[PDB]
């Protein structure tokens, strides 16, 4: 019933 | 830290890689941030959000 996505925050970028 | 997002609010692409403003089920919906598909891990919420922009 709950419907919970994960994420990771891009700190920075690699290039 | 891996955060909880709820859904997908609009999408672009910088660089050649495809970034996601997404809407964060543990912040708030003002606190939402840019994250690319390949740091997300929602697959789900960018196939809904294709289907509702078609």
Redesign the interface.
Same mark, same amino acid.
């Given at each position: 019933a709950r419907?919970?996505?994960?994420?990771?925050?891009?700190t920075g970028?690699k290039? | 830290?891996?955060?909880?997002?709820?859904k997908v609010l609009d999408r672009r692409v910088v *660089?050649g890689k495809v970034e996601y403003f997404?809407k964060?089920?543990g912040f708030t919906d003002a606190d939402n941030?840019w994250?690319?598909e390949e *740091?997300?891990?929602?697959p789900?919420?960018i196939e809904a959000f294709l289907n509702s922009q078609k």
């Amino acid at each position: 019933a709950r419907t919970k996505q994960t994420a990771r925050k891009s700190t920075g970028g690699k290039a | 830290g891996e955060f909880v997002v709820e859904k997908v609010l609009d999408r672009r692409v910088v *660089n050649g890689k495809v970034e996601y403003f997404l809407k964060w089920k543990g912040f708030t919906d003002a606190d939402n941030t840019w994250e690319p598909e390949e *740091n997300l891990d929602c697959p789900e919420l960018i196939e809904a959000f294709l289907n509702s922009q078609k």
